[PDB]
Amino acid sequence: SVSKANVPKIDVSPLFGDDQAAKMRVAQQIDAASRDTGFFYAVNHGINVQRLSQKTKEFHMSITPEEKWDLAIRAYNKEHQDQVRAGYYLSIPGKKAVESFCYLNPNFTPDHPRIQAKTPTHEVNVWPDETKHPGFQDFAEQYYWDVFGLSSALLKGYALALGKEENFFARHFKPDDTLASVVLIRYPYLDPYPEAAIKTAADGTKLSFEWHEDVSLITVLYQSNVQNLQVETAAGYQDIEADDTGYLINCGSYMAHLTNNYYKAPIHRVKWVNAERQSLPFFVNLGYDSVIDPFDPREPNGKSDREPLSYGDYLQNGLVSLINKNGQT
Numbered sequence: 410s411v412s413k414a415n416v417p418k419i420d421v422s423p424l425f426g427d428d429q430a431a432k433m434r435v436a437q438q439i440d441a442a443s444r445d446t447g448f449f450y451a452v453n454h455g456i457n458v459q460r461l462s463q464k465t466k467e468f469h470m471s472i473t474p475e476e477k478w479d480l481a482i483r484a485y486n487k488e489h490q491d492q493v494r495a496g497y498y499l500s501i502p503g504k505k506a507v508e509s510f511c512y513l514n515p516n517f518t519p520d521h522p523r524i525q526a527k528t529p530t531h532e533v534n535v536w537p538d539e540t541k542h543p544g545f546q547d548f549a550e551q552y553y554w555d556v557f558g559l560s561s562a563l564l565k566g567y568a569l570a571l572g573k574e575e576n577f578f579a580r581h582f583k584p585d586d587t588l589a590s591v592v593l594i595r596y597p598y599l600d601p602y603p604e605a606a607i608k609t610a611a612d613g614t615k616l617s618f619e620w621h622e623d624v625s626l627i628t629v630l631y632q633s634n635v636q637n638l639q640v641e642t643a644a645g646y647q648d649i650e651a652d653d654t655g656y657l658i659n660c661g662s663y664m665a666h667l668t669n670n671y672y673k674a675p676i677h678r679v680k681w682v683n684a685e686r687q688s689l690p691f692f693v694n695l696g697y698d699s700v701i702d703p704f705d706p707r708e709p710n711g712k713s714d715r716e717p718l719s720y721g722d723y724l725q726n727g728l729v730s731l732i733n734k735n736g737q738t
């Protein structure tokens with residue numbers, strides 16, 4: 410057997426209010442989790458995740474092959490050269506089981522100055538036809554803002570945890586410019602499940618996706634209640650329990666950089682499970698030009714021998730690197 414990872418449940422509701430001592434006690438919990446396995450469940454988060462899952466299911470189960478080509482990213486459809494990030498990521502039956510739909514900041518509109526400049530990592534979202542998917546675009550865009558609000562609160566907790574003022578990260582996480590993304594991932598039940606779509610870890614575990622660190626500041630994840638994630642600890646890979654009422658939170662490698670690995674980006678992987686399920690990450694990304702000076706909360710003077718890295722450089726290089734390491738998703 411594999412041991413269960415320590416993934417505490419943290420009531421994050423004080424991070425939405427004005428009781429400062431209560432916020433500090435939440436920050437301590439975040440600090441402890443960040444120093445241990447690197448994962449926790451945010452509870453009392455205020456998001457209607459059941460409705461999120463229902464609206465996502467209705468989308469995934471009704472979208473047609475024709476629509477998928479029409480929304481496809483460049484990796485699947487050469488006609489769509491502007492779609493590097495946003496759009497549909499197709500399955501390849503017999504070979505690749507997972508499929509997904511990614512969207513970015515709704516404020517990245519044709520008139521947005523970064524869209525006008527064609528700055529890397531900024532794209533205008535693509536959507537299915539409203540008559541085929543009534544309400545879907547509006548639901549999805551509202552979800553973006555609901556999970557942006559939770560993420561802002563969580564970033565206040567991380568800042569406090571690190572000995573900073575609560576706006577330390579959140580001041581770089583702004584509606585008009587965030588590079589954050591939502592991905593609506595569908596993992597299918599398949600009978601038979603093709604072996605080509607199953608990877609095998611060095612330890613023999615069957616996987617849907619190999620070990621990695623997240624490309625994010627933090628990742629704010631809703632999943633179905635089907636156990637699948639594993640985190641590498643000093644005691645080996647451990648199973649992260651599912652909890653479809655909470656959000657699973659972890660740091661990404663930008664946090665690791667900024668904190669000189671005080672808050673590591675935990676290495677994790679996705680086990681193969683033959684189940685129809687959802688994985689709905691929000692990758693908390695800053696603005697293209699956001700730069701935070703790296704520091705070290707284990708050093709008396711707080712100084713780090715890491716150099717400042719802009720978030721846009723981090724992100725563009727990280728997303729390419731992850732594709733090269735673990736394959737196009």
Ligand SMILES: N[C@@H](CCCC(=O)N[C@@H](CS)C(=O)N[C@H](C(=O)O)C(C(F)(F)F)C(F)(F)F)C(=O)O
Nearest residue numbers: 494495507509511590594617618623679688692738
């Ligand atoms: N396209 C997004 C970035 C996606 C980066 C990415 O591929 N991340 C991985 C690891 S967190 C990811 O999304 N993995 C998924 C998972 O962990 O369930 C799935 C998949 F990508 F298919 F959705 C899988 F594991 F299968 F790769 C963006 O532009 O912001």
Ligand SMILES: [Fe+3]
Nearest residue numbers: 621622623677
């Ligand atoms: Fe991940």
